[PDB]
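Progress note, project year one: complex with chloride ion.
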Amino acid sequence: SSVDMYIERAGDITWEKDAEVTTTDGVYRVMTRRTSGSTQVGVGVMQEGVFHTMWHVTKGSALRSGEGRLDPYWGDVKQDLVSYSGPWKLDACWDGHSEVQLLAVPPGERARNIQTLPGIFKTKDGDIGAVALDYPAGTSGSPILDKSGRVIGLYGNGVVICN
Amino acid sequence: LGSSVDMYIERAGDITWEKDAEVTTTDGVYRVMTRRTSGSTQVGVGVMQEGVFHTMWHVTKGSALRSGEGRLDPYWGDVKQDLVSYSGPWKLDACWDGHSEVQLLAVPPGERARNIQTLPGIFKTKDGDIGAVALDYPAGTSGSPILDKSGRVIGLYGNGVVICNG
Ligand SMILES: Nc1cc(N)c(/N=N/c2ccc(S(=O)(=O)Nc3nccs3)cc2)cc1/N=N/c1ccc(S(=O)(=O)Nc2nccs2)cc1
Ligand SMILES: [Cl-]
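Model obtained:
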């Protein structure tokens, strides 16, 4: 048997006004089915009919969904990204100075917003952000949001700065 | 001053092809560890070859590392390639033929190093064709070396397998 991977909608993607501080558009759990039952392997974002997640979560596997089978459209192993059904749509960038919110969706746990200041690390062309928190395996792909609710990164990836 | 990580490496084993694998600071393979208020966690893996430590850029964010020898400074780094080398230029130049089985020398957090023989898939990227290992391991296994039959490192787990022609 090949791995039976599917997505389930977990909630809306919204900035939460008083967060904790350290089918349709939304945030989805990426699940695997075994005879013994289901495991969450990651998270992703449906935007403009395109499902976005990390390449390591699916390794280009087709996904079952409420809308039928989703086939991979584009991916990059090095950036660790993959899109289903169409081109990559998550084009927002972090300004490199505003606090962000991680919309963490860990396995077997409630979706929640956590406000956090990314770390900044120097690169040769500039700087990149990091949200490295203590979340369980399977949280990778959780969206990182700016104050307008735009997805500026996925949990486990560097947060790209444009400034 | 700014954001910093307290990172260190620990040798996990020799890098060798294992003749009868399951089929689905000396040179060697190392765990990359980070010290946080919660404790020390493995965040990835890398390869010491010819006195140069090699890992994926995102594992270390290009940070200096502590080792048995003292401080290792990043020498070369590329966020786009997601690679970084310490102490000297990138030394891992072997490529996959695009058809032979390979071995992942997986070094997962809290688990023994082990060799798994597998056949990479081949995927189209804007740069060209690349191989990729279709085995699932936890995030902190990223950087584990992928080996050809002569024990040469032809890729790092999560970074793809380099194909000799395009
Ligand atoms: N100054 C430098 C000093 C170094 N020590 C160094 N090492 N480099 C490596 C590059 C690739 C690989 S690898 O694939 O073989 N991965 C693995 N091999 C075994 C295990 S993993 C390994 C090492 C690179 C340097 N500069 N490099 C540049 C590369 C590209 C471009 S580019 O503009 O042309 N963009 C692109 N186009 C198509 C693709 S990238 C500009 C500059
Ligand atoms: Cl890989």
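Chain B has one domain: 1-166.
The helical segments of chain B are 57-60.
No further modelling is planned for this target in the current period.
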